[PDB]
């Protein structure tokens, strides 16, 4: 098929990753979803060592431990799988590292995770960090740049994206480096709306539309998908695909982006 790249966030905790691959286009043209994102790992803080670390809840860990059965089937059919990282009420956040060296240590935990679990990239979602907690600093200018710069250096052939939200999103330049061009995609964080991300990426790699499967209206889902193509954008963010028969929500958007309706297994 041909059109904008559609993404699906899956809440590992309650929902199967495997559900993304159950949707294909009726025109015999391909997966309805191109990117699948594991929601989500976290940025935690160790107050004794004053060091943030990449935290995985047991349920997210389990998906990763069983990557062979839970993630491999999607990559087999061509769906790229990213791991998303969210703040976790612990002060430490992406725009919070006190030194290049500290951000790069977290960058390393990120690259190594993608490497070990054979993922295709990382996604940054700067929400719920609660900067200030645990004696942490408020957002600084350099922090996010350091982290992205280093992660990008770590995995040059992998995907790095972000939700256009939180402190980090407005802190993309520090020193001679603007890290916008190191991201593959950027998306609107408000499901049910159209908000063009104000970051320096081609329209082909920006998703102004963000929808929640099962919460967003099917007319809104159709409308944001029609507007994505009409405005010349190349990404369509979808969120919270579950295990129920969602063929119509999916067709609602596939017919606008791809000119085809979708069929689920």
From Swiss-Prot:
Gene Ontology CC: extracellular region
Domain GH18: 4-260
EC number: 3.2.1.96
Catalyzed chemical reaction(s): an N(4)-(oligosaccharide-(1->3)-[oligosaccharide-(1->6)]-beta-D-Man-(1->4)-beta-D-GlcNAc-(1->4)-alpha-D-GlcNAc)-L-asparaginyl-[protein] + H2O = an oligosaccharide-(1->3)-[oligosaccharide-(1->6)]-beta-D-Man-(1->4)-D-GlcNAc + N(4)-(N-acetyl-beta-D-glucosaminyl)-L-asparaginyl-[protein]
Example GO biological process: carbohydrate metabolic process
GO MF: mannosyl-glycoprotein endo-beta-N-acetylglucosaminidase activity
KW Signal (keyword) present: yes
Domain of life: Bacteria
Active site residues according to the UniProt entry: 127
Keywords in alphabetical order: Glycosidase, Hydrolase, Signal
Primary role: Cleaves asparagine-linked oligomannose and hybrid, but not complex, oligosaccharides from glycoproteins.
Family affiliation: Belongs to the glycosyl hydrolase 18 family.
Name of the protein in its database record: Endo-beta-N-acetylglucosaminidase H
Organism annotation: Streptomyces plicatus
Lineage: Bacteria, Bacillati, Actinomycetota, Actinomycetes, Kitasatosporales
Residues of the full protein shown: 48 to 312 of 313
């Amino acid at each position: 098929k041909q059109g904008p790249t559609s993404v699906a966030y899956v809440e590992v905790n309650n929902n199967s990753m495997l559900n993304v691959g159950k949707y294909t286009l009726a025109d015999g043209g391909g997966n309805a979803f191109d990117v699948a994102v594991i929601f989500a790992a976290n940025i935690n803080y160790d107050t004794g060592t004053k060091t943030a670390y990449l935290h995985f809840n047991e349920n997210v860990q389990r998906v990763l431990d069983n990557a062979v059965t839970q993630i491999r089937p999607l990559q087999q059919q061509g769906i790229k799988v990213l791991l998303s990282v969210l703040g976790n009420h612990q002060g430490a956040g992406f725009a919070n590292f006190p030194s290049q060296q500290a951000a790069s240590a977290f960058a390393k935990q990120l690259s190594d995770a993608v490497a070990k679990y054979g993922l295709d990239g990382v996604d940054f979602n700067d929400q719920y960090a609660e900067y200030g907690n645990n004696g942490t600093a408020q957002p600084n200018d350099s922090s996010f740049v350091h982290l992205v710069t280093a992660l990008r250096a770590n995995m040059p052939d992998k995907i790095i994206s972000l939700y256009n939200i939180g402190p980090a999103a407005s802190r993309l330049s520090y020193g001679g480096v603007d890290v916008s061009d190191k991201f593959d995609y950027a998306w609107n964080p408000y499901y049910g709306t159209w908000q063009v991300p104000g970051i320096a990426l081609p329209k082909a790699q920006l998703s102004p539309a963000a929808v929640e499967i099962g919460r967003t209206s099917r007319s809104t889902v159709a409308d944001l998908a029609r507007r994505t193509v009409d405005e010349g954008y190349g990404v369509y963010l979808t969120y919270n695909l579950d295990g129920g028969d969602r063929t119509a929500d999916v067709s609602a958007f596939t017919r606008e982006l791809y000119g085809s309706e979708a069929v689920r297994t």
